[PDB]
Structures are given as C-alpha cells and as structure tokens.
Amino acid sequence: MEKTHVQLSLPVLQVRDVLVRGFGDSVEEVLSEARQHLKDGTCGLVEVEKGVLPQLEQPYVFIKRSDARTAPHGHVMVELVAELEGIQYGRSGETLGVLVPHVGEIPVAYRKVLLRKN
Ligand SMILES: C[C@@H](N)c1ccc(I)cc1
C-alpha cells in the first residue's frame, strides 16, 4: 500500500546520452508514465542548463522542490509538474531537473529525493 512519499535515488544523466527523450504526447500521459517509471526504478534525471530543454521532447516532466524548510536525510522533498507550450500544470518550488526514461545510460551522479506520490 502506497505511502504519500517515497525515498528514491535518481540517476543523473547527461542530455546527449538520453535515448528516450520524454514520456509521451500529452500532459496527462507524461505525468502518468513518469510516475510509473519512478515506481519501476526506470526513471532518470537531467539537470537543466542552457541548451538542455531544446534537446528533449515536450511535454516535459520536472521534479520541483515541494518544501523549502526541511530536506529529510538529504532527500529533498519534491513533486512533479508538467509543461507544454509554455504552460505548467501544477505550481511548486525550484526545479531539480527534468525526468526522462532510463534505459541503461551511464549516470554521472545520483540525486536523492523524497517524492510525493500524488
Ligand atoms: C519494456 C521496455 N522495453 C521499455 C523501456 C522503456 C520504455 I519508455 C518503455 C518500455
């Protein structure tokens, strides 16, 4: 039975290594697929810098900071927000990165998060 939050260590991928550059074709589908890949352990994270988003596919799924007061165990509390054509679905804090499927790419680091399973 699903707790409200789950501790995960997400592999951080470089954008040019990512083979599957998004989760789907609609805001509702990308949030659904992101959540399922997170449960299956097949989700990576790309940190956002200049040049990154134009190399990925919309709609985007971002993990954003949900609580600026405590970060339990070094796991920052986060929630999902999708973006399509400049419009965001959800409101949250600072972006930690953009989520993508992970299909065996070698990561450069891991990001510890406490994910709100909304
Ligand atoms: C089942 C497996 N081949 C797979 C990997 C990545 C995605 I996205 C969907 C399915």
Curated annotation (Swiss-Prot):
**Which organism is this entry from?**
Severe acute respiratory syndrome coronavirus 2 (2019-nCoV)
Residue ranges of the region described as Disordered: 2-118
Q: Where in the cell is it found?
A: Host cytoplasm
Q: Source organism's superkingdom?
A: Viruses
What does this chain do?
Inhibits host translation by associating with the open head conformation of the 40S subunit. The C-terminus binds to and obstructs ribosomal mRNA entry tunnel. Thereby inhibits antiviral response triggered by innate immunity or interferons. The nsp1-40S ribosome complex further induces an endonucleolytic cleavage near the 5'UTR of host mRNAs, targeting them for degradation. This inhibits the integrated stress response (ISR) in the infected cell by preventing EIF2S1/eIF2-alpha phosphorylation upstream of stress granule formation and depletes host G3BP1.
Q: Where is the CoV Nsp1 globular domain?
A: 4-118
Q: Which residues of the full protein are shown?
A: 10 to 126 of 7096
Question: What name has this protein been given in UniProt?
Answer: Host translation inhibitor nsp1
The parts of the chain that form a coiled coil are: none
Taxon lineage: Viruses, Riboviria, Orthornavirae, Pisuviricota, Pisoniviricetes
